[PDB]
Amino acid sequence: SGAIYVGNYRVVNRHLATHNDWANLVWEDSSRDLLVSSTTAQGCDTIARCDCQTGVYYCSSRRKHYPVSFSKPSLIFVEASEYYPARYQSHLMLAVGHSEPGDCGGILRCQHGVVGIVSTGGNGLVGFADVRDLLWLDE
Ligand SMILES: NC(=O)[C@H]1CCCN(C(=O)Nc2cccc3c2SCCC3)C1
Ligand SMILES: [Zn+2]
What we know:
4% of the residues lie in helices and 47% in strands. It contains 1 helix and 11 strands. It has one helix at 19-23, and strands at residues 4-6, 9-13, 25-29, 34-38, 54-59, 64-69, 74-78, 87-96, 107-110, 113-122, 125-130. The strands form 2 sheets. Strands 6-5-9-10-11-8-7 form a 7-stranded antiparallel β-sheet, with no helix packed on it. A 4-stranded antiparallel β-sheet has the order 1-2-4-3. The protein is globular, with a radius of gyration of 14 Å. Homodimer.
């Protein structure tokens, strides 16, 4: 679990969105596993606007942060799960690192701010949904 809180927005994994997220929906994209909802409070985070390929992410299944080298946002095949049919997920970045199903929502950050959130994983890999191209989150 986890979310990004920026301005009057809450960014979460679309497959983990609550009834309240859907009732206050701003934007969602099943191909990116992202959903953004509106909030009444201002929130704590800032978004990176950069091309970093190294950063640090929070891994809830180890209660620890780990440094990672990650690929550029791209279209990657993701096997069927209880949440989605087999499909290509877009704007996804892979890295070698530990992750388990409940780790989705963990934040990836570089020196410039929040880069994205944990969205996929398995066998010593961890996939992050990029948020750096969503320029409207800052206004
Ligand atoms: N973005 C998606 O389509 C996700 C939706 C939730 C289920 N999917 C996962 O990749 N879950 C997951 C996360 C982290 C680690 C492991 C897993 S499943 C296998 C064991 C490792 C696909
Ligand atoms: Zn950066």
